[PDB]
UniProtKB/Swiss-Prot annotation:
GO annotation (BP), single: negative regulation of cell differentiation
Any one GO MF annotation of this record: poly(A) RNA polymerase activity
GO terms for cellular component: centrosome; cytoplasm; nucleoplasm; nucleus
Organism expressing this protein natively: Mus musculus
UniProt name for this protein: Terminal nucleotidyltransferase 5C
Catalytic activity: RNA(n) + ATP = RNA(n)-3'-adenine ribonucleotide + diphosphate
Complex and partners: Interacts with BCCIP and PABPC1; the interaction has no effect on TENT5C poly(A) polymerase function. Interacts with PLK4; this interaction leads to the TENT5C recruitment into the centrosome.
Effect ascribed to mutating G64A: Loss of polynucleotide adenylyltransferase activity
Domain of life according to the entry: Eukaryota
Similarity comment text for this entry: Belongs to the TENT family.
Keywords: Cytoplasm, Cytoskeleton, Nucleotidyltransferase, Nucleus, RNA-binding, Transferase
Result, substituting T278R: Increases polynucleotide adenylyltransferase activity
Annotated function: Catalyzes the transfer of one adenosine molecule from an ATP to an mRNA poly(A) tail bearing a 3'-OH terminal group and enhances mRNA stability and gene expression. Can also elongate RNA oligos ending with uridine molecule, provided that the sequence is adenosine-rich. Mainly targets mRNAs encoding endoplasmic reticulum-targeted protein.
Effect of G68S: Increases polynucleotide adenylyltransferase activity
Lineage of origin: Eukaryota, Metazoa, Chordata, Craniata, Vertebrata
Length: 331
């Protein structure tokens, strides 16, 4: 109900406007130039061309750390990743290809003025990753832009997705539809005296409770059973950023559960290595000290919250953590 929603104030709406209008460079591989895009322009292009092609855009939302930064300035979670969500129905395969073609066309809008241009070519030049699932329980397409700039622009087109786990401070989404309608129809720039009503939502459950957690830098969750192997990595990211567990005397039980879930999802040691290496690159680029501190946090949780039955997995994972941290110190 309304307990998960909240109305943004001018301070939050203003920072939302800066995030959507910030010029973000998108690195181009090869002879391709860097695209200077804004979240506002790419949303308007994608949503316009989607609805023009028969795909109704139910709503557009800002997700991730950016949504947290709009609610609380400099909360400690950073502002690298710009995550966008497009609630669109994807019944058949043709809708999935249409979503890709519209995104690649949106990149063509920012391409300045000799190169060969095509959908296959634009994907190679600017799309960092493109994952796609198409089952009865999950139907969503994700397109990420090149992150050699340092920032991660993710375009997530969700039809239906079973709820993913995140802590309170990472569960904020900002519905942009009222502000996008304002961008198209306003004759004056957005101001304190004239600005639309922007709504934020916490997928955690209670906005005020989650908002208080972000204001006091607290680690909390109400659905621990939905935690999978990645939960240990999200929890360690909050710890390295000076977020304290909001419920002491309970974190020991939660840390043990997160280590067990980590080992169940990643039994192979070579699988844990590739998961950490890609995690250290997509979260702590140009932050070698943060790479070391994150691994040392991860070592402390694994060393103190792994049961006696899994001593093999504990020693094996602790050794991998040390060798990854040693390679950071070796450079
Ligand atoms: Cl998880």
């Amino acid at each position: 109900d309304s307990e998960s929603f909240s109305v943004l104030n001018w301070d939050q709406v203003s920072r939302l406007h800066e995030v959507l209008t910030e010029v973000v460079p998108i690195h181009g591989r090869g002879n391709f130039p860097t695209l200077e895009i804004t979240l506002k322009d790419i949303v308007q292009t994608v949503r316009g061309r989607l609805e023009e092609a028969g795909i109704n855009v139910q709503d557009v939302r800002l997700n991730g750390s950016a949504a947290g930064h709009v609610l609380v300035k400099d909360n400690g979670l950073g502002c690298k990743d710009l995550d966008l969500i497009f609630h669109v129905a994807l019944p058949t395969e043709a809708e999935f290809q249409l979503v890709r073609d519209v995104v690649l066309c949106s990149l063509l809008n920012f391409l300045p003025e000799k190169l060969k241009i095509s959908p296959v070519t634009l994907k190679e030049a600017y799309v960092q990753k493109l994952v796609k699932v198409c089952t009865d329980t999950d139907r969503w397409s994700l397109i990420s832009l090149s992150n050699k700039n340092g920032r991660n622009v993710e375009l997530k087109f969700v039809d239906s997705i079973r709820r993913q786990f995140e802590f309170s401070v990472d569960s904020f989404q900002i519905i942009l539809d009222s502000l996008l309608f304002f961008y198209d129809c306003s004759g004056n720039p957005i101001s304190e005296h004239f600005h639309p009503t922007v709504i934020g939502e916490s997928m955690y459950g209670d906005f005020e409770e989650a908002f208080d957690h972000l204001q006091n830098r607290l680690i909390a969750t109400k659905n621990p059973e939905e935690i999978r192997g990645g939960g240990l990595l999200k929890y360690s990211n909050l710890l390295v950023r000076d977020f304290r567990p909001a419920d002491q005397e309970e974190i020991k039980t939660l840390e043990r559960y997160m280590c067990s879930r980590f080992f169940i999802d990643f039994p192979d040691i070579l699988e844990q290595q590739r998961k950490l290496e890609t995690y250290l690159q997509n979260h702590f680029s140009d932050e070698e000290r943060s790479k070391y501190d994150y691994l040392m946090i991860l070592r402390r949780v694994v060393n103190e919250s792994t049961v006696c039955l899994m001593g093999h997995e504990r020693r094996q994972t602790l050794n991998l953590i040390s060798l990854l941290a040693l390679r950071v110190l070796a450079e």
